[PDB]
Design a protein around this ligand. Structure first.
Ligand SMILES: Nc1ncnc2c1ncn2[C@@H]1O[C@H](COP(=O)(O)OP(=O)(O)OP(=O)(O)O)[C@@H](O)[C@H]1O
Ligand SMILES: [Mg+2]
Length: 780
């Protein structure tokens, strides 16, 4: 309407106007109105021409003091891209900032970092973050803007980059406006979202492609295809493992070798070759390789500080100790470095692999051996065997001379932590962790070898600096283990050494940032007062898209672009729920419930790509690909452990209400049978946890409390239509509420459960009868 009206009025009679539409949607209003005007010579340019055009426009003149000076050829815009995660995009921007601080002679060169976490790009948040810089001091001073477009972003990215980088502008509801100044550099950190034409939109831009180690060796210098950073290669993390490995592979004697601080040897290429050979991953990222290096460095450092490697002090009975240490630790790293996950490419199990751990205790005089035993063979060599089955885990980890020597040193080989007493377990565990006192915080937490190994894994990751991301079902033991460890390290002190955040779909980035900053203050306080490390724990973190913020906290070690303060003692753990899909029968039952769903699986926008989330047992969003190599399974809750927790709950009830042992037995057996049946019945129940047993016990307790009145009213009601144990009766009604009602195959459940009930109540019919009578009484 307005176009036609203006054309009727005194206007530009040579106006140049263009409209552009998506052919699939072209049937709509504005393309329809001008269909006659449809232009059939669609303008196009080859990618190289657009590249040269934008590169010319981005090029900052030499006279202009610009952050661009560091970038390729004074381009005030750059894209840093990777086909996968953790290959040096943020590192590249860091080094760019540093080089800018070196070159530009400026007292301060601001870095602004912006995280785009929302699936649909929020340009108003970007504008809000940039507006502080509208001040004039910045208009003639270099500033670097780093915009990280996390994996969480799915839509709005190309439009946003077009407007900001090309149109040089952003604008909001109120009317305040951002102008992209050429004196400032813009770098976009993005993962190449390859799925679409012969060229990706990002290619139009000055791009840096950061490459992984294997691509760095194979393909290779340039600033648009960086290799191994020299500060990292010259860092202790790479150099100690590199020097040790360099000697190891050549079969040199390490009996004398000791890494001298600040030393640097070899070349980036040889270091990468050795790391990739031993790493265990075929095409690792740089993060996986640093985690490998960081682990091997920490443990080799502790070995160097130990007495078994001190100036001899033991003669030569320990010849080959460092050779053994390097071999074993390269094997041990397999658990910490290697991924455990391989639309639903995200799954594996904990019991699938051994966890042979060796630790150097903070006393620098003892070692801890867990998860494996040493067995001598006829060939004079010593092998690593599974402590459970005795099967060989790794052959020739050491020679028999070193085994006998280490025995003479009282090193605790072949220890069976499952047969040890409680306090001996606590002593070994605390010594390994570096705790002086075996202050047992929970006698019901069973310190089995597996749980101790889990604790020690979390500990090593805390020590070296590998992020801790654990995957497990609800009630598999994560929160109790973390609590146990926090309490053990606390040692009775009155301190808040652990903060637990229960993450939900509504957990926003600002909530995570605030929680982390609060935990950081709390940790500074705790370390000052009590000298205790602090844990922050995110449970159900994948449940939110703000999980990308959690990635920043775990991997990037930052908070909304601001860095985390080391010297805090704050450790972060994240627990992610698993990625499972409901069975097809179960999805049928769900789609058939009532009038069915309001939206079909096709029309949904709530999905994990191909999968609607309602078809997932857990509403979980996709993991940032950087966290994928780090997630390790906590393990499934064993039948023995389930029964033990049920027994603990029923006994807690016994003390609360003074039941007998017969009722305890029956309640335990019926709760176990109920959980078993619901687990087997994958067509009606996909989710089973101990929270359901707590709920059923709560209901049982409620029925037991009221049982006097309910049984009186029941006898009266039934007399109107002219004996019972309160415990078995309340159990039956609790079972009714928790399991029997939601079910469709109620009869099979009652048949299974009845067998555990004492006579004469061991009948499915009596069970249904009592449930019916109680329902009637409640209607009456
Ligand atoms: N030469 C190297 N190149 C890249 N990363 C390296 C190198 N040497 C060590 N690293 C480690 O790899 C990690 C790379 O993290 P970085 O912030 O670059 O990841 P990223 O490129 O942001 O990936 P994503 O955005 O997917 O997390 C750093 O923590 C760094 O310590
Ligand atoms: Mg990054």
């Amino acid at each position: 309407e307005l176009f036609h009206n203006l054309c009727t009025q005194q206007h530009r009679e040579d106006y140049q106007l263009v409209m552009v539409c998506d052919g699939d949607w072209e049937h709509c209003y504005l393309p329809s109105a001008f269909s006659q005007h449809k232009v059939f010579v669609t303008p196009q340019a080859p990618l190289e021409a657009i590249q040269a055009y934008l590169a010319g426009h981005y090029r900052v003149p030499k006279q202009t003091l610009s952050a661009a000076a560091v970038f390729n050829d004074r381009l005030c815009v750059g894209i840093v891209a990777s086909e996968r995660a953790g290959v040096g995009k943020s590192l590249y921007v860091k080094r760019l900032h540093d080089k800018m601080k070196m070159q530009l002679n400026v007292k301060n060169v601001p870095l602004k970092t912006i995280r785009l976490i929302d699936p649909q790009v929020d340009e108003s948040r970007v504008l809000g973050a940039l507006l502080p810089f509208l001040d004039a001091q910045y208009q003639k001073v270099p500033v670097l803007f780093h915009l990280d477009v996390t994996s969480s972003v799915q839509t709005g990215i190309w439009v946003f980059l077009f407007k900001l980088l090309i149109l040089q502008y952003l604008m909001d509801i109120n009317g305040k406006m951002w102008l992209r100044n050429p004196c400032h550099l813009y770098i976009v950190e993005i993962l190449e979202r390859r799925t679409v034409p012969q060229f990706s939109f990002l290619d139009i831009f000055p791009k840096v492609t950061c490459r992984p180690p294997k691509e760095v060796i194979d393909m290779e210098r340039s600033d648009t295809e960086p290799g191994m950073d020299l500060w990292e290669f010259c860092s202790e993390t790479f150099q100690r493992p590199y020097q040790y490995l360099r000697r190891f592979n050549q079969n040199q004697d390490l009996d004398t070798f000791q890494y001298q601080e600040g030393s640097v040897e070899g070349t980036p290429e040889e270091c990468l070759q050795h790391f990739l050979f031993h790493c265990g991953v075929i095409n690792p990222s740089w993060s996986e390789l640093r985690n490998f290096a960081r682990f091997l460095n920490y443990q080799l450092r502790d070995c160097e500080a130990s007495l078994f490697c001190n100036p001899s002090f033991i003669g030569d009975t320990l010849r080959g100790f460092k050779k053994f240490v390097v071999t074993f630790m390269i094997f041990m790293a397999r658990d910490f470095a290697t991924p455990s996950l391989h639309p639903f490419s995200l799954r594996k199990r904990w019991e699938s692999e051994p966890h042979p751990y060796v630790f150097f205790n903070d006393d620098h005089t003892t070692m801890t051996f867990i998860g494996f035993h040493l067995q001598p063979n006829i060939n004079g060599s010593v092998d690593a065997i599974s402590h459970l089955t005795g099967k060989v885990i790794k052959r020739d980890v050491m020679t028999r001379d070193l085994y006998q020597g280490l025995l003479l040193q009282r090193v605790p080989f072949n220890v069976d932590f499952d047969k040890l007493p409680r306090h001996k377990k606590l002593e070994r565990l605390c010594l390994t962790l570096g705790i002086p006192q075996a202050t047992d915080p929970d006698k019901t937490y069973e310190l089995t070898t597996d749980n101790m190994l889990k604790i020690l894994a979390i500990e090593m990751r805390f020590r070296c600096g590998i992020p801790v991301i654990i995957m497990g079902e609800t009630g598999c033991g994560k929160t109790r283990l973390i609590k146990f460890l926090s309490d053990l390290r606390r040692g009775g002190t009155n301190a808040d050494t652990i903060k637990l955040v229960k993450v939900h779909g509504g957990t926003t980035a600002d909530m995570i940032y605030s929680r982390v900053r609060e935990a950081e203050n709390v940790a500074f306080a705790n370390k000052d007062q009590h000298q205790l490390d602090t844990i922050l724990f995110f449970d159900e973190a994948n449940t939110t898209e703000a999980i990308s913020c959690i990635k920043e906290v775990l991997c990037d070690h930052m908070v909304d672009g601001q860095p985390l303060a080391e010297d805090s003692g704050l450790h972060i753990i994240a627990a992610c729920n698993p990625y499972r899909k409901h069975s097809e029968e179960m999805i049928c039952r769900l789609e058939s419930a009532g009038l069915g769903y309001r939206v079909s699986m096709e029309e949904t926008a709530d999905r994990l790509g191909s999968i609607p989330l309602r078809q997932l047992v857990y509403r979980v969003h996709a993991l940032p690909p950087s966290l994928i190599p780090l997630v390790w399974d906590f393990g499934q809750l064993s039948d023995v452990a389930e029964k033990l927790y049920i027994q603990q709950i029923v006994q807690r009830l016994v003390e609360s209400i003074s039941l007998d042992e017969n009722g305890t037995r029956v309640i335990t057996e019926v709760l176990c049978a109920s959980q078993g049946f619901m687990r087997k019945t994958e067509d009606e129940c996909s989710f089973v946890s101990l929270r359901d047993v707590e709920r059923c016990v709560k209901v049982f307790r409620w029925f037991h409390e009221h049982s006097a009145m309910l049984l009186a009213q029941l006898n009266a009601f039934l007399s109107k239509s002219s004996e019972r144990d309160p415990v078995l009766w309340s159990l039956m009604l609790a079972i009714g509420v928790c399991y029997h009602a939601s079910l469709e195959k109620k009869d099979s459940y009652r048949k299974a459960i009845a067998r555990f009930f004492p006579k004469p109540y061991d009948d499915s019919r009596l069970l249904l009868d009592e449930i019916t009578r109680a329902q009637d009484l409640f209607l009456d």
